[PDB]
Amino acid sequence: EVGVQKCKNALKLPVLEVLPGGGWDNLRNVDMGRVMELTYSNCRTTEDGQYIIPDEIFTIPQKQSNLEMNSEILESWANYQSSTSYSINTELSLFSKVNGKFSTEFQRMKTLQVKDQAITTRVQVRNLVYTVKINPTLELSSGFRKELLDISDRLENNQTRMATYLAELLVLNYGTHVTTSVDAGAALIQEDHLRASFLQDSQSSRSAVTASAGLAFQNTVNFKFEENYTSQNVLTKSYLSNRTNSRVQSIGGVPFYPGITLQAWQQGITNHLVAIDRSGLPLHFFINPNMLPDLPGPLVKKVSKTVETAVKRYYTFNTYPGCTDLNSPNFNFQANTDDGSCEGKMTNFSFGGVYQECTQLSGNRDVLLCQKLEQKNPLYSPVHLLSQIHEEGYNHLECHTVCEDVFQVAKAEFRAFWCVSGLLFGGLFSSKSINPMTNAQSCPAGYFPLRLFENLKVCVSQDYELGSRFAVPFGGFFSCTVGNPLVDPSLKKCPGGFSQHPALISDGCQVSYCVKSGLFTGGSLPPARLPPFTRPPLMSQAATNTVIVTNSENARSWIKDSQTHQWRLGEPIELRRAMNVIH
Amino acid sequence: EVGVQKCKNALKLPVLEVLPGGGWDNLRNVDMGRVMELTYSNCRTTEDGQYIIPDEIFTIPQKQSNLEMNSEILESWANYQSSTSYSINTELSLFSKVNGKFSTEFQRMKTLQVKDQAITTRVQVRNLVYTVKINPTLELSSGFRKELLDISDRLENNQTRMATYLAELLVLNYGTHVTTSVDAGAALIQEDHLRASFLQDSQSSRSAVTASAGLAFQNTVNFKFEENYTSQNVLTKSYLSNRTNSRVQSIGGVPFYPGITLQAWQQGITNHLVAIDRSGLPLHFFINPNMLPDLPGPLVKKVSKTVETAVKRYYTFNTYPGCTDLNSPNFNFQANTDDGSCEGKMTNFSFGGVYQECTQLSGNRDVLLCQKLEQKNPLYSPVHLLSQIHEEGYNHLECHTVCEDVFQVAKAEFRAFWCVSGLLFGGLFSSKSINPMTNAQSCPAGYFPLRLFENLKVCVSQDYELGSRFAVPFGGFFSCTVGNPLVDPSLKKCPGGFSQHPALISDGCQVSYCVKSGLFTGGSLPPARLPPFTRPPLMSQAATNTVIVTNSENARSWIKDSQTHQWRLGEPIELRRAMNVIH
Amino acid sequence: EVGVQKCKNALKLPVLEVLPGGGWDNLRNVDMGRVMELTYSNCRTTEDGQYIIPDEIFTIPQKQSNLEMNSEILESWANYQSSTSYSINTELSLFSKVNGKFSTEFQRMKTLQVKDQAITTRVQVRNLVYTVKINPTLELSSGFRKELLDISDRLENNQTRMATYLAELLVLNYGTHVTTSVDAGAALIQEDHLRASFLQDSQSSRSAVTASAGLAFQNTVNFKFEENYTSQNVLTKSYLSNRTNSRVQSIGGVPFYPGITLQAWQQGITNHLVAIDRSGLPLHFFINPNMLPDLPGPLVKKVSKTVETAVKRYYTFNTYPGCTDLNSPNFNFQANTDDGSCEGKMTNFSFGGVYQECTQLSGNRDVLLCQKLEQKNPLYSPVHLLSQIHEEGYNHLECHTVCEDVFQVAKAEFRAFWCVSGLLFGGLFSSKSINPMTNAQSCPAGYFPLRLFENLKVCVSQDYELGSRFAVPFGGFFSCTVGNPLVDPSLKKCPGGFSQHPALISDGCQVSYCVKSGLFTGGSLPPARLPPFTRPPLMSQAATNTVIVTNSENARSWIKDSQTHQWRLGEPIELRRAMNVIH
Ligand SMILES: *[C@@H]1O[C@H](CO)[C@@H](O[C@@H]2O[C@H](CO)[C@@H](O)[C@H](O)[C@H]2NC(C)=O)[C@H](O)[C@H]1NC(C)=O
Ligand SMILES: *[C@@H]1O[C@H](CO)[C@@H](O[C@@H]2O[C@H](CO)[C@@H](O)[C@H](O)[C@H]2NC(C)=O)[C@H](O)[C@H]1NC(C)=O
Ligand SMILES: *[C@@H]1O[C@H](CO)[C@@H](O[C@@H]2O[C@H](CO)[C@@H](O)[C@H](O)[C@H]2NC(C)=O)[C@H](O)[C@H]1NC(C)=O
Ligand SMILES: *[C@@H]1O[C@H](CO)[C@@H](O[C@@H]2O[C@H](CO)[C@@H](O)[C@H](O)[C@H]2NC(C)=O)[C@H](O)[C@H]1NC(C)=O
Ligand SMILES: *[C@@H]1O[C@H](CO)[C@@H](O[C@@H]2O[C@H](CO)[C@@H](O)[C@H](O)[C@H]2NC(C)=O)[C@H](O)[C@H]1NC(C)=O
Numbered sequence A, B, C: 001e002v003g004v005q006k007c008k009n010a011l012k013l014p015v016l017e018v019l020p021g022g023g024w025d026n027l028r029n030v031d032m033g034r035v036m037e038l039t040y041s042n043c044r045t046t047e048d049g050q051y052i053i054p055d056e057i058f059t060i061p062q063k064q065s066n067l068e069m070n071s072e073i074l075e076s077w078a079n080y081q082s083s084t085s086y087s088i089n090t091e092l093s094l095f096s097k098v099n100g101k102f103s104t105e106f107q108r109m110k111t112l113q114v115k116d117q118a119i120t121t122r123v124q125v126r127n128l129v130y131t132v133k134i135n136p137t138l139e140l141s142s143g144f145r146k147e148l149l150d151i152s153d154r155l156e157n158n159q160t161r162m163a164t165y166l167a168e169l170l171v172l173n174y175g176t177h178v179t180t181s182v183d184a185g186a187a188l189i190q191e192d193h194l195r196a197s198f199l200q201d202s203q204s205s206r207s208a209v210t211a212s213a214g215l216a217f218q219n220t221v222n223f224k225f226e227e228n229y230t231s232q233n234v235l236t237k238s239y240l241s242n243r244t245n246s247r248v249q250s251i252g253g254v255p256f257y258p259g260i261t262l263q264a265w266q267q268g269i270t271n272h273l274v275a276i277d278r279s280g281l282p283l284h285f286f287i288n289p290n291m292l293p294d295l296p297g298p299l300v301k302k303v304s305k306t307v308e309t310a311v312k313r314y315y316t317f318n319t320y321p322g323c324t325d326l327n328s329p330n331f332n333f334q335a336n337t338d339d340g341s342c343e344g345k346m347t348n349f350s351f352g353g354v355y356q357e358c359t360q361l362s363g364n365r366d367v368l369l370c371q372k373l374e375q376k377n378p379l380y381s382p383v384h385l386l387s388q389i390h391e392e393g394y395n396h397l398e399c400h401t402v403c404e405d406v407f408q409v410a411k412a413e414f415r416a417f418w419c420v421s422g423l424l425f426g427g428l429f430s431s432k433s434i435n436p437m438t439n440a441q442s443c444p445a446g447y448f449p450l451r452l453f454e455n456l457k458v459c460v461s462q463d464y465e466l467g468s469r470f471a472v473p474f475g476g477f478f479s480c481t482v483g484n485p486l487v488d489p490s491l492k493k494c495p496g497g498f499s500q501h502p503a504l505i506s507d508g509c510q511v512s513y514c515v516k517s518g519l520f521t522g523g524s525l526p527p528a529r530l531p532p533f534t535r536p537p538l539m540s541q542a543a544t545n546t547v548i549v550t551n552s553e554n555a556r557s558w559i560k561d562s563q564t565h566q567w568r569l570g571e572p573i574e575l576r577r578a579m580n581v582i583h
């Protein structure tokens, strides 16, 4: 009787199913959450008189219908068009070469080009109908507003590392962007993968290749699967023979089956409309004093700085520099960002060994952390590489039968070294990784592991006749703070010929290691690594109540009242009586 | 008149049958339970106006329809795609190489590749319709909330080993994950199994193999079973002759029969939609102070640590390291995880014998446990391998005719040894296993059993002329705490050439044994071993009432009131009057 | 019961969907916002009796239908007709050569001509129906009026750099123009791309080329896709062979499919009408004392000067001077504006290095900005090029447990130099750009970066044997204030042979740099750079209340009352009593 169903009973019209305002993940092109609030109170319609739209939504009739007769050749996977999220992946940002490179449509296309030495062609029937946009005066959703107040409460009780944790659960549920405009329509695409040596002789007749690819697309749709085709004349005999893959997907409308008139596909697009393009803005753009009137001024500029840090950390991880030229050696298959590390010679290095010590600062009673946090050399110059503090909580139970239990914490800082007539290297495996020497979390035969950063193992053998089959050279560790001195004989990268691999993200700082195997390189493409990148804190910090919030340079002060009402602006006679009881 | 039927009478629409929120087992890809609460109060619909959805559910119209013309070749069973649970099996976890490897679809595919030396190809018509997701603000179900309170009660009456038992009945009923997003659709798949020597000569024309496999798939669907096919031209004469198996399964829609137009299959998908992909989060992620407001803070971080231990124990069991290379010898067929134990030489070892002693600490009266818990040598260096305590309860009946009965417990710790001119080895069989030397729970001819770990038998014969037909060599016992010293002449694995096998899980710790038979290896694939991995306790621990719960480091205290009301936060004037009567 | 639905129930007529009054972006031909208010109170109709129009709207029946039998040849992309926004892109302005050159239809056409050496021909069926215009007496919208009052409030509290920021969020949401008249209709266009050497021999028979192009267009529409064509006689055998691309788009009406009678397309245009031409006026034209009666006179002439500056800044950026002649060398592909920089010789220049110093004026406590704002020479005459001040805010927390937090600001002015036996040049990459030497944000091998303008890196190597593969020459920096002295051996442009590229827009002033690579030139076309071009201010300026507003030269004064009522005109007896308490 309220909301949609009140409008839907009076009008008896469908609701437009393609709406802006939701969140958007831009590494993996998926949408998530609902940032903006959508209400159906005035019973608005599209001025066709055909759909029902919310109140803060205006549509623009496009009624456009493209129809292409030539496929387009896109040879490299580095410059990637998306066909559904092209306007939002190509924004001007620092990470424009990482957007969209963890999606379903991209990971298939990179696989089919590398494993077959192939080039791809697509041809398309696109058919845009509306453009749906949001008004500039707009209200946040009920569930998204409550999660911004919780980050503000943790920042005003001096609880960092809990506000940081709640900011990374905001990226996980709402993405990195907000879509401000979509495009309702229905596409129909065919992608083929031709052998790359079929293009190189037909450099003059490249226009004859793509003319037959768009010719075969309209035989596939118009003719039923039995061969009544009109394309097999001259070069639709090697086009069929140099191709390595073919698929046809429809995105809106009715489902596609071979042999359906393009007349009949285009008459089922009504009431089956999806978003075939979209654009938007980053997520921290919508955190400003205009959208949040209840909080003070400089407090929402501190929440918006926390969310901006969590988004940029999510792009800093899931970024793999390496070599990208396919015909060159040292080709890294997991790398999504070029480095210039191609055509670079190598030089062998000898590492003496790794060792690890612990400190055991506070928790001397009832918990002994400083036995597994220590690792000594099985057999140069060591480097420190990390200063990491490990905290653990335990439980007493004082009984008196009534009892009580108290929870302490136990700190133990550890230090992990490596030496710059030497131990061999057999790979690494962690609690989120495997060793690709064995395709399993095990060192090979003869090798023995030893812990280095409290979560991963270091496959090492001291021999020179039996473990020489799995021995791969080593290039050096570095971190987010200290680069290795092996490059520039500093910078944070591998030397030439080597490739880096992530290992052991530890509280907003990952360390890396350089190898030269060729076996760590290949395999399947890695998935995206989702936030939170930190385990939850133990609530060890005490809450410090803040009552008055001020800034010095325009003489504005916000006084929180009793009862936790709200934040009102401080009149200059009440803050005069509130600072004496404070100071 | 309430719930679904109120909405269903007014709207007269079907309910969408593919919903998130339920649990999910990730070793065996099955779903179980219902973790989240789903209510039908606002009578929401999908904005098509076609289905009825719950209140805390938003759908995303995809309306996509893939159609592939080439089969895909996947040669090894180690890297396994699932076609229905691919997004959730490939999560970043420690056990990513164990997910999905106890399901129906996997165990068939591993069988057909090993027993035939075959490779598999699949081709597919996929047709995704909606994407159904859950809101981030969400309530737990009524039945799942009551089972989390019962684990908290056992932890606050100092009843460990009963809270551990109730946590493993939570994994049995609700799985290891919670699905947060599903994909409603309908697939149509054909899998074939070609001989592996048919690929190796057609390395150049591998693109001609897969083009005919996708050609035969559309003759099978479009043509009725009588041969009107258009594929038998050149190489659809050995493709039919090198294949070893073929099946066609449909997953949604109407049932498949040979000869049905793809037009007609795609018009029955409405109202017959199933989940063709899903993704989710682990089960202990949803146990936090946000979801459970009634319990104290550090108490639900102790329940969530108990459930995380029970899930990781369920992946630690059902994990079989071994050799995986098929053409290599020492191939273990039951192994689902590689080890590097391939291409390893063997060395014979002589074991003197096993013997077992008991202690009989407490139950000296009316129960004699220390006669069957003892086993002496029928005929080096012994090792202890286990310190296990065995508890049994009995019953007095004091009569006075009125009577009364009291229940005691009887403890008897046992120790089980083995010796590091020697007894022969004929296999083992237990109360959950058989001896594969006989395919039965019996020692072979000449062999006599003797107990070792109070539940299994040790087939042993002292002869050298008659029991030499069933004698297999022996590689050594180890446990979850002590590895054997026979490897690295320590580590917890077999030496080279040998294979390990589970035996006698005893209270969260299994022991293993290394053999070299080739007969223990083969057979059928083992099923998953389901929790609980411990028999129920005898309630021997006394309940210790806890009233006040505090943590030291933010000065918060929770005071339980009388009557077992609930846990309220302790004001600093009531805990002042509650600690004096306590301490 | 009000608005549209009251008129729509009584009349039972559709609403005309093509209306003026909305905003319009003129670089990218898209429409956005709604500047004018549209009300449906009198229930007016089009005097056909066919549509429903708003009250302040008059339509003109055209009922015209063009039909062309010859394609038109447009060879160069510099003079670009738009076919949907031709009347509004060709206005008399300073930036008439930049209008429409960031749209979807233009960027495709520039790509297909450069990459193929092609010329384009279009043929069209146009069919104009109405002309819809706005009355001269007209009211602003509710949402656009509220955003003009907010710019006026920031200008009367002496808050510049916040009123400048709110003016650039007005261009982002409402564009650069307002459409005052549209044209409802439905076009049907075919564009082809012929090889440019096919025109040059048929200079006499250019009329035979375009006669067959309009002949093939009516075989495509009238005949179904099977070849029943009547065009293949003499020169529809090389016209089919010299063409490189072909598409057919419809803009209004029903969707196009090959084989539909032109009879049948022209009977579906009713109720499917879109804007096929439009014209309008700039956005600051509609900010005058007539439209805003509440504000004073000289105050709305100050708001309208602020918005005019933000629009002209948006055209000053997104303007790329360079070479445009395609067959000439030094061809810049990203350039949209000619320069005369073609056919110009080059001269090598040696730059010693770049260095950077900081000042740290105010924020000496708790924040050290003057360590990363400094960069020293790794190894002439330096020039200053910029004087930029960097402000950052921090947070104290004075505790007393009650606490309070104060927000300061920290200023640190920096200076960035470059020298007019020399460092090599390897490219630049920034926080909104990449290095095109690597197609990634990385310096090549041997090169090391060093910061220059607090956001970008300068790829530099001091060697002469290894980094000679990626070394490109350098032409000099300049800015919006200082041109380089290398041209005219001043002007703000490159010397001959070089090309400029944008880098580091910093608060309404960009700096540029001249290179000569040929690799920085190519690639994909850049998207439009959208406002705001400045990060939000930190509210450091104090609000200065203004009460009376006067101008000297007609003796008019506006007195703001109490309560923030409004601005009334000052009677000469109240301002007499208001200036004494003021002065
Ligand atoms: C507010 O939180 C910060 C962050 O932890 C506290 O700063 C640290 O406090 C510890 C405790 O003495 C010191 O050992 C560290 O050196 C401090 N680090 C920094 C960067 O200041 C701070 O003390 C807290 N303030 C209050 C009043 O609790
Ligand atoms: C893949 O493409 C190449 C073209 O580069 C094909 O090679 C030609 O095939 C035709 C077929 O009759 C021959 O007449 C030519 O002599 C071949 N060579 C050249 C240089 O054109 C090749 O056949 C294609 N692959 C398959 C399997 O057909
Ligand atoms: C709470 O339960 C624990 C777990 O059993 C008890 O700890 C054991 O108690 C027995 C009985 O004296 C001792 O022999 C063990 O050595 C204890 N083990 C550990 C690890 O502490 C504990 O005593 C119980 N507390 C109360 C008050 O009943
Ligand atoms: C299994 O595949 C092999 C191909 O590796 C088939 O062997 C070929 O069969 C054709 C059939 O006429 C012969 O002409 C070839 O000479 C055979 N050998 C090779 C190397 O191509 C084999 O026939 C297939 N199995 C069955 C049962 O047909
Ligand atoms: C009104 O705003 C202007 C703009 O900032 C102020 O002018 C500057 O004020 C600072 C502060 O003393 C001076 O250092 C600058 O030299 C001034 N610049 C110019 C161009 O005047 C102005 O002072 C403000 N007026 C009031 C009353 O606050």
Ligand SMILES: *[C@@H]1O[C@H](CO)[C@@H](O[C@@H]2O[C@H](CO)[C@@H](O)[C@H](O)[C@H]2NC(C)=O)[C@H](O)[C@H]1NC(C)=O
Residues within 6 Å of the ligand: C195, C197, C198, C201, C238, C241, C242
């Ligand atoms: C592209 O256009 C040129 C015309 O400039 C074509 O060249 C002529 O092709 C015809 C076809 O039989 C020949 O008779 C002429 O001798 C060719 N030359 C001239 C100067 O007219 C060329 O063939 C076209 N391209 C394609 C692929 O057909």
